[PDB]
Design a protein around this ligand. Sequence first.
Ligand SMILES: O=c1ccn([C@@H]2O[C@H](COP(=O)(O)OP(=O)(O)O[C@H]3OC[C@@H](O)[C@H](O)[C@H]3O)[C@@H](O)[C@H]2O)c(=O)[nH]1
Length: 448
Amino acid sequence: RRRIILFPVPFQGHINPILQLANVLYSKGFSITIFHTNFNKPKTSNYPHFTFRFILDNDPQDERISNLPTHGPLAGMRIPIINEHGADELRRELELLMLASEEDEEVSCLITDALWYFAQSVADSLNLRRLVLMTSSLFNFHAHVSLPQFDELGYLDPDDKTRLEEQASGFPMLKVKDIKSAYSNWQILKEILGKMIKQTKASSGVIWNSFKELEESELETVIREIPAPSFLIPLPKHLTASSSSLLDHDRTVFQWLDQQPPSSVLYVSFGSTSEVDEKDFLEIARGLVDSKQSFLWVVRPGFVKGSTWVEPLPDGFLGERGRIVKWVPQQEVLAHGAIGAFWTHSGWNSTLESVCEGVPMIFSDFGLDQPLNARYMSDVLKVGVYLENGWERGEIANAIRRVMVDEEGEYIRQNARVLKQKADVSLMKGGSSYESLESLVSYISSLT
Ligand SMILES: O=c1ccn([C@@H]2O[C@H](COP(=O)(O)OP(=O)(O)O[C@H]3OC[C@@H](O)[C@H](O)[C@H]3O)[C@@H](O)[C@H]2O)c(=O)[nH]1
């Protein structure tokens, strides 16, 4: 009997992939222990089959995180804080857990978010193998390792170098526009992106939340840059991240979706972290109204700057085919037959979820890996359209309509339907994802 310890980054788009992986691994016969901060903790009563151990965040709270808040662009400062100061606590806790293990039981390995690059020299010190879980796409990692050339071509200078915004250099997928968006706040990113890449290269294995036919162009880079084995597993095809939600689900939404004709409803959701200037939020609203299609729109409270949920929204300005909710079980909704399209912020989990449900997309982005996910899905796969010039109602309403109603967008809908079938075929015996999971499980069993 073998135990796996998993250590997520405590944000929605990080615990979701990592707890899906833990359920999958638990299905292959492993014991699961999850290490978590108290901050942003999942409902552990939804995981009766997991052991939960809360660390680094506890109750005589250290002063670097003691006053750090819980909302907005800022709570993420715990990732650098914990990377630079958490090693000794992580080592005691791993030592305690190994010491407390029954002897018919062995810790096969540690799996952490790639962002926890500090975990690598901790696991080494304990002669424990660490595997990395990547929460964004092989394609964006190819951009990360391409960064030395980007900076030297003048691409990440947002001020002094502008206005050469089309086809980019050793990377014809993207426009220069997309590289500047991706790395806008530059040297916060490069230290973590540096140390993260350096220590996943040093890990014992990298698990990618993806499937081979989704990013086949990018495989050779990952094989050539990372000596550690790589495994491509599409987690949304295995299970939803539903029970690792950190907000309560509406689920009244399903009685209303049951009243829509098939493929007639646009799902709108801009992630778990994004915020928008009220001026922008009412232009998004009017684009939905001008589109003339039914929409179900998740507006997470705080989304709007600065209001507490939608107080700028008028009469029911929306309504008679529009609905606003605070939070849904997103993938379950994408799977309901009423949903014909998904307007996303191009977060990698949402994007993969929609790909795995066969829903074409409209792409907006808020930076980081998002504009490259958006360009990749919209121009290489061509499973949606990309609104790359900001918020304008007209251009919003034509994007929605072209994906959902226009004959001209039928190839985009067909692409989405086919991409899904490729994800399901990869899961069957002899498929790319199936063989990765079989390799990963046998690999983890040999580390023991
Ligand atoms: O209403 C909702 C909206 C969203 N969600 C879930 O929230 C998760 C959001 O993850 P996303 O990747 O879409 O995006 P987030 O912006 O929230 O954060 C993510 O950004 C991109 C990923 O690369 C990063 O790893 C993560 O930061 C999805 O798994 C989605 O299913 C819901 O369950 N309900």
